[PDB]
Amino acid sequence: FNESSVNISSTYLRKVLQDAIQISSVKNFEYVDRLDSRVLNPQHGNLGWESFTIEYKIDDLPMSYLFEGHQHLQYLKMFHFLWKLRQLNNLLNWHFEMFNELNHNVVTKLSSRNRRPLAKSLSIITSIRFHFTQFLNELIAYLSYDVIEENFQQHIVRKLFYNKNDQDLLLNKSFMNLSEIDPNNDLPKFNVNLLTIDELVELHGTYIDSIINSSLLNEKTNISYIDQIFNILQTIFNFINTSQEFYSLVCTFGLLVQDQEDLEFQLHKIKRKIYKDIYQHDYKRQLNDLKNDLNRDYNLKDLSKLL
Amino acid sequence: QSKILNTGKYLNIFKRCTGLHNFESLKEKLTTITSLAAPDLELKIDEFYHRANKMLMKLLFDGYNFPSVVNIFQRLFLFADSFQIDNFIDSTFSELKRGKLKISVSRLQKQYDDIFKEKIENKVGVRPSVYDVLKKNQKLSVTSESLYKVVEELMDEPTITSVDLTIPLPFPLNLVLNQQLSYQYEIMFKLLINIKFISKYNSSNWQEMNYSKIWTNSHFNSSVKKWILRCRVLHSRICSFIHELENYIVHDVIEHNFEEIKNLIHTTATNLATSELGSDINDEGDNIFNGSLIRGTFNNNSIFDSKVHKHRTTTYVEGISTVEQLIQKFLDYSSTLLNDSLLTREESLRQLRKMLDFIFHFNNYIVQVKKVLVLLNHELFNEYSKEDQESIDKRFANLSDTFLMQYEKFGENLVTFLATIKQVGERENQGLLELSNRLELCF
Amino acid sequence: GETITLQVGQCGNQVGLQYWQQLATEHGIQSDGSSTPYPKDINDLQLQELGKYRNDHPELFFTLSDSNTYTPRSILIDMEPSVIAKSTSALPMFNPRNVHLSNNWINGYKYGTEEEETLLNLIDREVDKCDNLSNFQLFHSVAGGTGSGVGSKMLEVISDRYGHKKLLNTFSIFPSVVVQPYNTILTLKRLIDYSDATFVFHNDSLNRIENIGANKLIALVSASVSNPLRFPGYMYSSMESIVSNLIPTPDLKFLTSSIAPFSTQKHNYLNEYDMLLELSNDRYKTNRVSGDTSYISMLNYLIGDNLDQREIRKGILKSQQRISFVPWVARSVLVVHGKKSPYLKNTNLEGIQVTNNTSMIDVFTKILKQFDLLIKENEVMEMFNESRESVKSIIDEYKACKEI
Amino acid sequence: GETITLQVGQCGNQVGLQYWQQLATEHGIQSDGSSTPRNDHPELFFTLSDSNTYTPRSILIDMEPSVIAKSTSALPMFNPRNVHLWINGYKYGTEEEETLLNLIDREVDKCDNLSNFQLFHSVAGGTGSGVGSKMLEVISDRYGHKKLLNTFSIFPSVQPYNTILTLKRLIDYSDATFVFHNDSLNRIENGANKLIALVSASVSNPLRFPGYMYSSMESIVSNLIPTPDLKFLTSSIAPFSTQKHNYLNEYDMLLELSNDRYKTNRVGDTSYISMLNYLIGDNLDQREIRKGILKSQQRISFVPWVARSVLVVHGKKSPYLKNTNLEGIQVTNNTSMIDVFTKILKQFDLLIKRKAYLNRYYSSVEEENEVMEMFNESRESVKSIIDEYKACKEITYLDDD
Amino acid sequence: NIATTTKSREEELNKRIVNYKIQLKLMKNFLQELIDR
Amino acid sequence: REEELNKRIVNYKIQLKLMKNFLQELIDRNN
């Protein structure tokens, strides 16, 4: 995924997908065959992370004709957003592992003279990473267990299996004698509401629409919540990219043991940039604005208190 | 249209094969098409087509023992049992390496039949095996179309480049083993015989290089000793490269793909074993009449037939159920064998042709070297001459440049071949990518 | 990823046996290694009139052989063979090849050094069966003899043989004799140096919980920590992701766990809302915690079928105010919606809480005071001094954690 | 092509008995030579009569009749016509040269297309080692070098003299010599002939149970002997099979076959010259083998001038063995031979400076000179092979500097 | 741009062309055998 | 780029159809 979207070929995608299927728990999944990966728009300016999409093939069934392409497009939009969030969540884990390993390999073995300043800078960096991880985890928890799960249980499970009580079902017609039954006892009663074709299409369309057009994900400071969230995500991306430079500088400090003063100055400069600009100047300001924005909404006040 | 035509053809094949004049013996209950305006015409056609497939499938599998014909084709064409072909190459090693026209063609036929189609007869009434029937059918003949020329169309040299094997088939078996499938099998036969022959040339040359008296002689001077050591190491590299290439082609391409077909055919055989012959079709009185005629030009439902698509068929559930899929599976298998092998692209084929030519010519050069080494050392020159310093120095100087040329040519060919495999594997073929990784990890 | 479990010492083996029996029970793997057919899913509703398929990840811990037989990724290291014999008899599925058999900490450390090649070969053999390894799990007692020295030497060996490229947990059990304080400090020095995340368990607090054996609680907590890994869900599903959420800096790596005892008594918790409040209680924590404590990170585990979202949301909101967070850490409480194993008939909820609080100041203070009292070739005394200074290096750090 | 087995000495005869019992079990041949209810080819190792009886091609040679009597009684299908009954033994072999030459020529005439000679003998066998050392000379002289020889020599656990005298001819005439040590065999067991028999039986599996590849002994050996000087092979066997806790996959067989503890000879750091791994199971998963080959290539230290290729043969299990789990054998060519040869040379020098037992060999002045020159030649040849194996390790092996 | 997919598009087209080159040449050989009589 | 392969595919479809029509013509005339 590091290389541009034009470089990735079909064979590499197939190798990646098969290896990931073997590693994970999907290899025992009943319909593991149906899974298939693809790249949507192989533009030069788009990297692999910005184009990869997982596609669940249901073309072999007549059900695919009920599900119009618009619904699938809204299923690939929401997947794209969630894919970005989880990409950042995992990048922070890799950051944690690499910095923790560097702590044992270099800093703790360094000379006692300059060990303390480097230890302090490393602790600052890791604490910033911890703050970002907490924020991302809270956002993912809110989406997963208040938007996707609630909408599923409310619009699919409760529409199909529980009774769709209506004003016509209220009337008990057995006040009429109605001794007869038709067409015959041979016709089953099926534990699920009998839905028309248009009813099935509308049911799945409403279920998808509720998720994609939720309170947080709508397009409605005259700015939408999505834009603020994406701005915070860009802040985290910048943090990761700068932390990689800090990684290279500190490992070059480890390798050295007149250059020491230059490297120490660069370390101070990088620490100042990350601590002041990215975190204090950008992240805390954006999060304060977002928290104040959320309190104006009754639904999102609870999320604001945590997130 | 296809269903009607194929149903009729399949019933005709059954009647002509088993000899029945009509299907009275099966005593099955059948329903005929009452009218052209009936609503169940498509259902009736589908049922008839399924009946025809059921009968022809059971004929082929249970009666004609097709599953064993698949293993027989595997053995004879792709050397799933390489003992016999190894004996054949060993017996005619001197002939096969000679130019096409410089050797008698009729001898190869006989020297092949003594190896392959040998026989012991069985008493009257004892059933012949299908292998017994197909052994005597096969014929190996030399053809004018060389491998590198015949494969270029579907984009003297030593006789090995032009020896082919053909197997005519009984009716109806030849309908499933269509000529296009047998031709794709023949191409693989020619490729594998080339590689097997070169491996047999790499082993014999390895036997002389190590243990023949001239090469193993201890009384050479230091320079000739180091020259011999360099030559032995280079030949070891060539041997390892050829064994790696053969391993990929035979285990990573042929056997790996064949496992799927073997499993599918076993499943189909088990499915048909428990299935009766002949199916009963019933129907109601069909009182619809005017409610079904729909006379006129046509209905507006024709659009739905074109709107739907039937390109989604997979999972090979319950084995192969239609003879068309039975043929399609083997056609796909043969296409996979040709595509995976380095014969489909132009870059891969050209690099393979250069590599094989270079190895063969190197073996011939090794053979001609044996004569030169006699003159260099004295202790054995006197023995061989029974039947000057400047000249000896000239001979060694000539061998220096010749051997260096071969060494550098090998390096060039190897580099180009690896680059070509890497690009093709990254672009199209998954199987070639792992071969590229293995060969790169080798050198 | 894959997880390799290492058990050192008599206490470690006793805990690990029940830990593996717990996991085998949850995944339906019998003691002989035979697998049980997976029951149909409960929330996968189906239309109604009125074998190898699975949706869990047991192979993350057990090696699935070609003959459909599971085998734990465990390595048993000790000297007394009686405990190993009992463990193997209880669980024949343990691989005999994986067993290694042979008071002063120095003697055990030197024994581990001399025979390091064999143990290292065993570790490499276990790793070779793992593709894309994730982390190591260690079950050992800080004090007690064989466990201290052997586990410390294995800690160093594993840390430096793989370049620290995989995180390494530690399910250390702290002691509740003249040699014990020395062993505790000496082992804690290497715990500081090498371990990536330490679960502190105190035997006295475990006895306090029990009377309301002691190894069963440790096994339950350890086998419930990795519930998201074996039953993947929306969040986490990776051991590095769980640990990274509770360790802000490499120094503040010591975690402690709280356990809800009443998983079976018929007066069990009414709902998720009640259990969320009860988990914060200080009487069921596995480490003695005072009222001056402050929490650096919060993580709550919930294990049940179709948990009510309203109750969880309200419980998180109420519990957020009660908890005293460290000034420089944002108020954040996280709840893990784990999935109960379908093989378990018990329908009652279970919930384990894992915390990173500042109560470690008092515990390490007690250890340090006992060591100082007991102190009152020369190389060993230098190591004692180094351990004293290393422990103080995080004593003062946890104290400074209070300050912005 | 067909192969001829030669058994020399008591240890050789016992190992041969186990080997032929294993081979007959694999091909379902009964003790009396009758068949049991073909795709396999026992003809390469058994002579088939037109009365449906299988008899081994082996030739039994021993100084005493007790061992041969036990071997023949245990396996009645041996042909009695093939039974025949250090310096003293070698001189005795000179006297019986005509009879043995005709005896071997009978077997060669009986087969259709000879391929190679197998030899089962013990280097430390005393007199029997002498007669086997003469056997190698006579065979190599009469049949030239078109037919190669394979010797499954058993190394030793006055003996140094015998080991050096036998190793001189073993180096000179053998074409591919396996090395087995009783020390490593009994270490693995922690009887011993059942390991050697199993390894030797599996080494030829691709010949008796044909597949796609490796249909001849030339192909099997040529992959392991780049130079005729480096002719000693180290064999490794995976013992963990047929137990409940056996290897979970063929990939783990490939990874754990390389452990130094399973090798059949004492080994520190070693460099591999060539590799070839045997996998023998009814069904083999290709993708596991590909992954294992890649890991094995990335993990093993090859010498600089070798192509660095690892070859895995997909052997087929015998129908007569019921559904047994996977098993595998590894045959390698290492530079570890220098250690054992150095040990032998050190013992020989230590016991040659001290005239301990040379009175049993030096009979007169001419005998003293004869034994001295013979011993010097043997010592020089062993040093030459040690120096060659040592020069293989370095990177300037191909340089003329 | 056309969507990328795990299955090799160019491989499928190339295999189709090769299978169309076998049918053509076999048909030509048969027609040659038919015409010359 | 793959347009070119599709173009060649259709060209060979036409050529195969022409060959089959040639066979039918020849057989019809011989009868």
Residue numbers in the entry:
A (entry chain D): 462 to 681, 687 to 723, 736 to 785
B (entry chain J): 375 to 529, 573 to 804, 814 to 869
C (entry chain B): 3 to 52, 70 to 121, 129 to 202, 209 to 244, 262 to 425, 440 to 467
D (entry chain I): 3 to 39, 73 to 120, 131 to 202, 211 to 243, 262 to 338, 340 to 473
E (entry chain K): 231 to 267
F (entry chain L): 239 to 269
What text comes from the article?
The γ-tubulin ring complex (γ-TuRC) is a structural template for controlled nucleation of microtubules from α/β-tubulin heterodimers. The exposed γ-tubulin molecules recruit α/β-tubulin heterodimers by interacting with the α-tubulin subunits, thereby realising the function of γ-TuCs as structural templates for MT nucleation. For ascomycete yeasts, MT nucleation occurs mainly from oligomers of the compositionally much simpler γ-tubulin small complex (γ-TuSC). Whereas the CM1 motif of CDK5RAP2 binds to pre-assembled γ-TuRCs in vertebrates, the CM1-containing receptor proteins Spc110 and Spc72 promote oligomerisation of yeast γ-TuSC on the nuclear and cytoplasmic side of the SPB, respectively.
Here, we determine the cryo-EM structure of the Candida albicans cytoplasmic nucleation unit at 3.6 Å resolution, revealing how the γ-TuRC is assembled and conformationally primed for microtubule nucleation by the dimerised Spc72 CM1 motif. As the MT nucleation unit comprises higher oligomers of structurally identical γ-TuSCs, two complementary data processing strategies were pursued: in the first branch, all γ-TuSC units were treated as individual asymmetric units, resolving the structure of the γ-TuSC unit within higher oligomers to 3.6 Å, which was sufficient to build and refine a full atomic model of γ-TuSC components. Comparing the models of non-oligomerised and oligomerised γ-TuSCs revealed extensive conformational changes within the γ-TuSC unit. While the N-terminal parts of GRIP1 domains are structurally unaffected by oligomerisation (residues 91-308: Cα RMSD 1.86 Å (Spc97), residues 150-306: Cα RMSD 1.42 Å (Spc98)), the C-terminal parts undergo a hinge-like rigid-body rotation that guides the GRIP2 domains and the associated γ-tubulins into a MT-compatible conformation, in which the γ-tubulin molecules are in much closer proximity as compared to the isolated γ-TuSC. This conformational change is accompanied by remodelling of an ascomycete yeast-specific extended interface between the GRIP2 domains and the formation of an additional interface between the γ-tubulin molecules on both spokes, primarily electrostatic in nature. Upon oligomerisation, an interface forms between adjacent C. albicans γ-TuSC units. Our high-resolution cryo-EM reconstruction of the γ-TuSC unit within higher oligomers displayed density to the amino acid side chain level for two α-helices forming a coiled-coil on the outer surface of the Spc97 GRIP2 domain. For both α-helices, ModelAngelo predicted a sequence highly similar to the CM1 motif of Spc72, revealing that the CM1 motif of Spc72 binds as a parallel dimeric coiled coil, comparable to human CDK5RAP221, but, surprisingly, different from monomeric CM1 binding in budding yeast Spc110 10.
